[PDB]
Write an enzyme that holds these catalytic residues in place. Structure first.
Site, PDB file in Angstrom:
ATOM      1  N   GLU A  35       0.858  -1.208   0.000  1.00 12.93           N
ATOM      2  CA  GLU A  35       0.000   0.000   0.000  1.00 12.93           C
ATOM      3  C   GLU A  35       0.879   1.237   0.000  1.00 12.93           C
ATOM      4  OE1 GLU A  35      -2.995   0.223  -0.558  1.00 12.93           O
ATOM      5  OE2 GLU A  35      -3.936  -1.698  -0.041  1.00 12.93           O
ATOM      6  N   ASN A  46      -7.760   8.569  -5.609  1.00 15.33           N
ATOM      7  CA  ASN A  46      -8.514   7.508  -6.298  1.00 15.33           C
ATOM      8  C   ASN A  46      -9.302   8.092  -7.470  1.00 15.33           C
ATOM      9  OD1 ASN A  46      -7.715   5.460  -4.552  1.00 15.33           O
ATOM     10  ND2 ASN A  46      -9.110   6.225  -2.957  1.00 15.33           N
ATOM     11  N   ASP A  48     -12.303   7.934  -8.106  1.00 13.53           N
ATOM     12  CA  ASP A  48     -13.580   8.537  -7.730  1.00 13.53           C
ATOM     13  C   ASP A  48     -13.373   9.855  -7.001  1.00 13.53           C
ATOM     14  OD1 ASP A  48     -12.772   7.879  -5.128  1.00 13.53           O
ATOM     15  OD2 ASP A  48     -14.579   6.722  -4.645  1.00 13.53           O
ATOM     16  N   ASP A  52      -6.484   8.013  -0.572  1.00  8.04           N
ATOM     17  CA  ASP A  52      -5.964   7.044   0.391  1.00  8.04           C
ATOM     18  C   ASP A  52      -4.794   7.610   1.180  1.00  8.04           C
ATOM     19  OD1 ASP A  52      -7.784   5.121  -0.673  1.00  8.04           O
ATOM     20  OD2 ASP A  52      -6.187   4.023  -1.662  1.00  8.04           O
ATOM     21  N   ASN A  59      -9.030   5.037   2.999  1.00  8.76           N
ATOM     22  CA  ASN A  59      -9.716   5.867   2.033  1.00  8.76           C
ATOM     23  C   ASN A  59     -10.659   6.875   2.685  1.00  8.76           C
ATOM     24  OD1 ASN A  59     -10.526   6.882  -0.486  1.00  8.76           O
ATOM     25  ND2 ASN A  59     -12.069   5.286  -0.804  1.00  8.76           N
TER      26      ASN A  59
END
Ligand code: CL
Ligand code: NA
Length: 129
Positions: A35, A46, A48, A52, A59
């Site tokens: 990650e 992200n 959308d 993160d 998120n």
């Protein structure tokens, strides 16, 4: 802060992630490596428009407030900036909520795609724990 692999395994153990909801420590360390490369200051946008944050790339769509993720929630009740601290307590506490939300560590798509079913114990091999 950029942790070493055993340094991070030790702080996660201290803050109670070892076998939390049945996930051994190497699962948590493997997830952190892919990650964030063990970097608490990691951030990634992200598609959308959520972001993160931190060592476990939590998120803003559901778990923390960053003030710029429309229609999102704040289920961990923290500013997302808290998740970038050299002190990993907030990320750990929020992670415990996430992995309890019903899908276990599949919530971390990098865990599902790169850690799940592998020899995750290698991530803590040799660590003075
Ligand atoms: Cl599970
Ligand atoms: Na949010």
């Amino acid at each position: 802060k950029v942790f070493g692999r055993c340094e991070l395994a030790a702080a996660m153990k201290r803050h109670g992630l070892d076998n939390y909801r049945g996930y051994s420590l190497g699962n948590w360390v493997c997830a952190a490596k892919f990650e964030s490369n063990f970097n608490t200051q990691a951030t990634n946008r992200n598609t959308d428009g959520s972001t993160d944050y931190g060592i476990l790339q939590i998120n803003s769509r559901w778990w923390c407030n960053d003030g710029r993720t429309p229609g999102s929630r704040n289920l961990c009740n923290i500013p997302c900036s808290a998740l970038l601290s050299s002190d990993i307590t907030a990320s750990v506490n929020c992670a415990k909520k996430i992995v309890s939300d019903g899908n276990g560590m599949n919530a971390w798509v990098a865990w599902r795609n790169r850690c799940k079913g592998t020899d995750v114990q290698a991530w803590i091999r040799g660590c003075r724990l």
